[PDB]
CSV table of C-alpha atoms in Angstrom, one decimal:
chain,number,residue,atom,x,y,z
A,4,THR,CA,-4.5,-13.5,22.7
A,5,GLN,CA,-5.0,-15.7,19.9
A,6,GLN,CA,-8.7,-14.9,18.8
A,7,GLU,CA,-8.0,-11.9,19.2
A,8,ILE,CA,-4.9,-12.0,17.4
A,9,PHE,CA,-6.8,-13.5,14.5
A,10,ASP,CA,-9.7,-11.3,14.3
A,11,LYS,CA,-7.1,-8.2,13.5
A,12,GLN,CA,-6.5,-10.5,11.0
A,13,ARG,CA,-9.6,-11.2,9.8
A,14,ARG,CA,-9.8,-7.2,9.8
A,15,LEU,CA,-6.4,-6.3,8.2
A,16,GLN,CA,-7.3,-8.9,5.2
A,17,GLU,CA,-10.7,-7.3,4.0
A,18,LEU,CA,-8.6,-3.7,4.1
A,19,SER,CA,-5.3,-4.7,2.2
A,20,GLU,CA,-7.6,-5.9,-0.3
A,21,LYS,CA,-9.7,-3.0,-0.2
A,22,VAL,CA,-6.0,-1.4,-0.7
A,23,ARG,CA,-5.2,-3.0,-3.7
A,24,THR,CA,-8.0,-2.8,-5.3
A,25,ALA,CA,-7.5,0.9,-4.6
A,26,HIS,CA,-4.3,0.6,-5.8
A,27,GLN,CA,-5.3,-1.0,-9.2
A,28,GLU,CA,-8.1,2.2,-9.7
A,29,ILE,CA,-5.3,4.1,-9.4
A,30,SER,CA,-2.5,2.5,-11.1
A,31,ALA,CA,-4.8,2.4,-14.4
A,32,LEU,CA,-5.6,6.2,-13.5
A,33,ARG,CA,-2.3,7.2,-13.7
A,34,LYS,CA,-1.7,6.1,-16.8
A,35,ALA,CA,-4.3,6.9,-18.2
A,36,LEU,CA,-3.3,10.7,-16.5
A,37,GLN,CA,-0.3,10.4,-18.3
A,38,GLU,CA,-1.0,9.2,-21.6
A,39,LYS,CA,-3.5,12.0,-21.4
A,40,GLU,CA,-0.2,14.4,-20.2
A,41,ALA,CA,1.6,13.1,-23.4
A,42,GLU,CA,-1.2,14.2,-25.5
A,43,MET,CA,-1.2,17.7,-23.9
A,44,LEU,CA,2.2,18.0,-24.8
A,45,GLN,CA,2.1,17.1,-28.1
A,46,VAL,CA,-0.1,19.7,-28.8
A,47,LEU,CA,2.3,21.6,-27.0
A,48,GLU,CA,4.7,20.6,-30.1
A,49,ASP,CA,1.9,21.5,-32.4
A,50,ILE,CA,1.3,24.4,-31.8
A,51,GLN,CA,5.6,25.1,-32.1
A,52,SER,CA,5.5,23.7,-34.9
A,53,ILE,CA,2.6,25.8,-36.7
B,1,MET,CA,8.1,39.6,-42.7
B,2,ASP,CA,5.9,39.8,-45.7
B,3,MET,CA,3.0,36.9,-44.8
B,4,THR,CA,-0.3,39.3,-46.1
B,5,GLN,CA,-3.5,39.2,-44.5
B,6,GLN,CA,-5.1,35.8,-45.5
B,7,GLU,CA,-2.0,33.7,-44.2
B,8,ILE,CA,-2.2,35.7,-41.0
B,9,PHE,CA,-5.9,34.4,-40.7
B,10,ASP,CA,-4.9,31.0,-41.1
B,11,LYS,CA,-2.5,31.8,-38.3
B,12,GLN,CA,-5.1,32.4,-35.7
B,13,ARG,CA,-7.5,30.3,-36.9
B,14,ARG,CA,-5.1,27.4,-36.4
B,15,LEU,CA,-3.8,29.2,-33.1
B,16,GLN,CA,-7.5,29.5,-31.9
B,17,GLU,CA,-7.8,25.6,-32.7
B,18,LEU,CA,-5.4,24.2,-30.7
B,19,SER,CA,-6.1,26.8,-28.3
B,20,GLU,CA,-9.4,24.8,-28.2
B,21,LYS,CA,-7.5,21.1,-27.9
B,22,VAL,CA,-5.5,23.3,-24.9
B,23,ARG,CA,-8.5,23.9,-22.9
B,24,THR,CA,-10.1,20.7,-24.0
B,25,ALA,CA,-7.2,19.1,-22.8
B,26,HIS,CA,-7.1,20.9,-19.0
B,27,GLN,CA,-10.1,20.0,-19.0
B,28,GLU,CA,-9.7,16.4,-19.5
B,29,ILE,CA,-6.2,16.5,-17.7
B,30,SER,CA,-8.3,18.2,-14.3
B,31,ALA,CA,-11.0,15.5,-13.9
B,32,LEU,CA,-8.2,12.3,-14.4
B,33,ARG,CA,-6.1,13.9,-11.0
B,34,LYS,CA,-9.5,15.1,-9.3
B,35,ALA,CA,-10.7,11.3,-10.3
B,36,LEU,CA,-6.7,10.2,-9.0
B,37,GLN,CA,-7.5,12.8,-6.0
B,38,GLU,CA,-10.0,10.8,-5.0
B,39,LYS,CA,-8.8,7.3,-5.2
B,40,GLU,CA,-5.8,7.4,-3.6
B,41,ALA,CA,-7.8,9.4,-0.9
B,42,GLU,CA,-9.5,6.2,-0.1
B,43,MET,CA,-6.4,4.0,0.1
B,44,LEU,CA,-4.8,6.3,2.7
B,45,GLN,CA,-7.7,6.4,4.2
B,46,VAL,CA,-8.0,2.6,3.8
B,47,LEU,CA,-4.1,2.7,5.2
B,48,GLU,CA,-4.7,5.0,8.1
B,49,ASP,CA,-8.1,2.5,9.4
B,50,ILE,CA,-5.2,-0.3,9.0
B,51,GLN,CA,-2.8,1.3,11.4
B,52,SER,CA,-5.4,2.3,13.7
B,53,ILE,CA,-6.5,-2.0,14.6
C,12,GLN,CA,4.2,-13.3,20.6
C,13,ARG,CA,2.5,-11.6,17.3
C,14,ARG,CA,3.9,-8.3,16.6
C,15,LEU,CA,2.1,-6.6,13.8
C,16,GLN,CA,3.5,-3.2,15.6
C,17,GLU,CA,6.5,-3.1,12.8
C,18,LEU,CA,3.7,-3.2,10.5
C,19,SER,CA,1.7,-0.3,12.0
C,20,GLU,CA,4.3,1.9,12.7
C,21,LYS,CA,6.0,0.6,9.2
C,22,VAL,CA,2.2,1.7,7.7
C,23,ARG,CA,2.0,4.8,9.3
C,24,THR,CA,5.3,6.2,7.8
C,25,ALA,CA,4.4,5.5,4.4
C,26,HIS,CA,0.7,7.0,4.8
C,27,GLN,CA,3.0,9.9,6.1
C,28,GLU,CA,4.9,9.4,2.8
C,29,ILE,CA,2.4,9.0,0.6
C,30,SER,CA,0.6,11.9,1.8
C,31,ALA,CA,3.7,14.3,1.5
C,32,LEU,CA,4.7,12.7,-2.0
C,33,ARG,CA,1.2,12.8,-3.3
C,34,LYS,CA,0.9,16.7,-2.1
C,35,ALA,CA,3.3,17.5,-3.9
C,36,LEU,CA,2.9,15.9,-6.9
C,37,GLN,CA,-0.9,17.8,-6.9
C,38,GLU,CA,0.6,20.9,-6.1
C,39,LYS,CA,2.9,21.1,-8.9
C,40,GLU,CA,0.4,19.7,-11.6
C,41,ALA,CA,-1.7,23.0,-10.3
C,42,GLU,CA,1.0,24.5,-10.7
C,43,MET,CA,1.3,23.4,-14.5
C,44,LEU,CA,-2.1,23.2,-15.1
C,45,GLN,CA,-2.0,27.2,-14.6
C,46,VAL,CA,0.4,27.7,-16.7
C,47,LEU,CA,-2.2,25.9,-19.5
C,48,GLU,CA,-4.1,27.7,-18.6
C,49,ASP,CA,-2.9,31.0,-19.6
C,50,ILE,CA,-1.6,28.7,-23.1
C,51,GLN,CA,-4.9,28.8,-23.6
C,52,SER,CA,-6.0,32.1,-23.1
C,53,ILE,CA,-2.5,33.5,-24.8
D,4,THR,CA,0.4,41.9,-37.2
D,5,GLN,CA,3.0,40.3,-37.8
D,6,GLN,CA,4.5,40.9,-34.7
D,7,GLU,CA,1.6,40.5,-33.0
D,8,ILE,CA,1.4,36.7,-33.9
D,9,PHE,CA,5.2,36.5,-34.0
D,10,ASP,CA,5.7,37.9,-30.6
D,11,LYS,CA,1.5,35.7,-29.4
D,12,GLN,CA,3.9,32.8,-30.5
D,13,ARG,CA,7.0,33.5,-28.5
D,14,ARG,CA,5.8,33.9,-25.6
D,15,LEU,CA,4.0,30.7,-26.3
D,16,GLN,CA,7.0,29.1,-26.9
D,17,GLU,CA,8.4,30.2,-23.1
D,18,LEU,CA,5.3,28.8,-21.4
D,19,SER,CA,5.2,25.6,-23.0
D,20,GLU,CA,8.7,25.3,-21.6
D,21,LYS,CA,7.7,25.9,-18.0
D,22,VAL,CA,5.0,23.3,-18.8
D,23,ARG,CA,7.4,20.6,-19.8
D,24,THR,CA,9.8,21.3,-17.5
D,25,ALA,CA,7.1,21.4,-14.5
D,26,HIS,CA,6.0,17.7,-16.1
D,27,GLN,CA,9.6,16.7,-15.7
D,28,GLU,CA,8.8,17.9,-12.3
D,29,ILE,CA,6.0,15.7,-12.1
D,30,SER,CA,7.4,12.7,-13.8
D,31,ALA,CA,10.2,12.5,-11.2
D,32,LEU,CA,7.5,12.8,-8.2
D,33,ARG,CA,4.7,10.3,-9.7
D,34,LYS,CA,7.9,7.7,-9.8
D,35,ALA,CA,8.6,8.3,-6.7
D,36,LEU,CA,5.1,8.4,-5.1
D,37,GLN,CA,5.1,4.9,-7.3
D,38,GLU,CA,8.4,3.1,-5.1
D,39,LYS,CA,6.6,4.3,-2.2
D,40,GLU,CA,3.2,2.6,-2.7
D,41,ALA,CA,4.8,-0.5,-4.0
D,42,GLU,CA,7.1,-0.3,-0.9
D,43,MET,CA,3.8,-0.1,1.1
D,44,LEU,CA,2.3,-3.3,-0.2
D,45,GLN,CA,5.5,-5.1,-0.1
D,46,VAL,CA,5.1,-4.3,3.5
D,47,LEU,CA,0.5,-5.7,3.5
D,48,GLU,CA,1.7,-8.6,1.4
D,49,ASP,CA,4.5,-9.7,4.3
D,50,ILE,CA,1.8,-11.8,5.9
D,51,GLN,CA,5.1,-14.4,6.2
């Protein structure tokens, strides 16, 4: 029903934004992770080149 | 096939120093993904909450 | 006739798929990190 | 020994190779995961 649906909306939007905030932290954490793995590979190549 | 000791010693020196950078990479990698594990679990948990409304 | 039940079912699939992918990723990362331990301890 | 080093250097190349293939696999799985996370958001964004 009308009000029952809106309550779903209110709950959802609060929930979605939590997901978007989580994802940003994830997406930014993933880049940091990727960059860090890149340093790790650069190191393996240095051990190889010496 | 004729390196001598000192050049060998220096090999071990560089090999060791890079072995430490590897440990450092392992630690930093190991912590970054654990962190990543946890924010993904938090987002997935919220996905559950959404699904159950 | 608001049907977010279609969304609920879509979200459920996403949670499922994201979760398996993420677990596959974690295991392959652990494989990789184990080889680093091997490299470090050699 | 120089052979002990050349061995403890060839073993590292082998192991580094394992890291690199595993990292390529990780890279593809991460890209898969990314697309799935973004495709999910495309669902949550459908408030219209």
